Ligand binder design. Structure first.
Ligand SMILES: [Zn+2]
Ligand SMILES: [Zn+2]
Lengths: 8, 114, 144
């Protein structure tokens, strides 16, 4: 829910 | 290139080499009909399958409310300002984000790719 | 025991004031978001005009997605850094993050600046409807 590399 | 059908039973013709005159023929297997080949080409395969999708784009697409349109690019034929644009909208299009344009206004349906 | 009694003296809390940032901070966050959206628009225009060229090992679709994701993630990080600069010493979100008791700088940033990109299956929100994400958006919109 954050970014592509983070968390969903 | 294309497929042609027999004139008696309307079945599918098949290519056959004429051994005597060295002329390609198409013969129906279920009867004795034969017709000489005019095109001289049989099997064409485009592996890159590069096909202009302007042939696959319908003019009616200009009536879709859900598509985006711009007034920047005018039509070539009628010079209409509205033009509804969209991407390939096709699977196995390789990689193409090109915008295809369709002219709004009735019955023009001109399609340009820029 | 002794630190819990001193905490009875000093006290600890979390409130709305912790989430609020300076007006300048909010302005900077908004400017960063505007610049990022403009850069994404420019990338989309490059792709539409076929100026974009595939990155080695990636398709044009994949390289466009990677470029857009990079722009959006850098803007998200910059907004987060601005929000974290805004935090005061008294800020309690910052207190809990610094102590390590709970929370992270990611949480502070999402609370104060920008929630960030929502991604499903490692990609941006998919085109679940026909060639669009939701019915409210126009077809073939790859913007943020
Ligand atoms: Zn026949
Ligand atoms: Zn026209």
């Amino acid at each position: 829910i954050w970014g592509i590399g983070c968390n969903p | 290139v294309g497929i042609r059908f027999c004139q008696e039973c309307n079945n599918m013709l098949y290519p056959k080499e004429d051994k005597e005159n060295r002329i390609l023929l198409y013969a129906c297997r279920n009867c004795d009909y034969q017709q000489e080949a005019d095109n001289s080409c049989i099997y064409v395969n485009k592996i890159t399958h590069e096909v202009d999708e302007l042939t696959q784009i319908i003019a009616d697409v200009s009536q879709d409310p859900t598509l985006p349109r711009t007034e920047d690019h005018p039509c070539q034929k009628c010079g209409h300002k509205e033009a509804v644009f969209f991407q390939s909208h096709s699977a196995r299009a390789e990689d193409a984000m090109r915008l295809y344009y369709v002219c709004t206004a009735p019955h023009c349906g001109h399609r340009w790719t820029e | 025991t002794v630190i819990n009694n001193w905490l009875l003296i000093e006290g600890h809390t979390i409130g709305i004031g912790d989430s609020i940032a300076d007006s300048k901070t909010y302005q900077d966050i908004q400017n960063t978001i505007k610049k990022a959206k403009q850069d994404v628009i420019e990338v989309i225009e490059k792709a539409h005009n076929n100026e974009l060229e595939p990155t080695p090992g990636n398709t044009l679709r994949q390289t466009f997605e990677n470029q857009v994701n990079r722009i959006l993630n850098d803007a998200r990080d910059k907004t987060g850094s601005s929000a974290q600069k805004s935090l005061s010493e008294y800020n309690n979100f910052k207190s809990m993050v610094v102590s390590g008791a709970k929370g992270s700088k990611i949480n502070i940033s999402q609370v104060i600046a920008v929630v960030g990109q929502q991604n499903v299956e490692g990609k941006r929100i998919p085109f679940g409807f026909k060639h669009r994400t939701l019915p409210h958006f126009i077809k073939d919109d790859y913007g943020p």
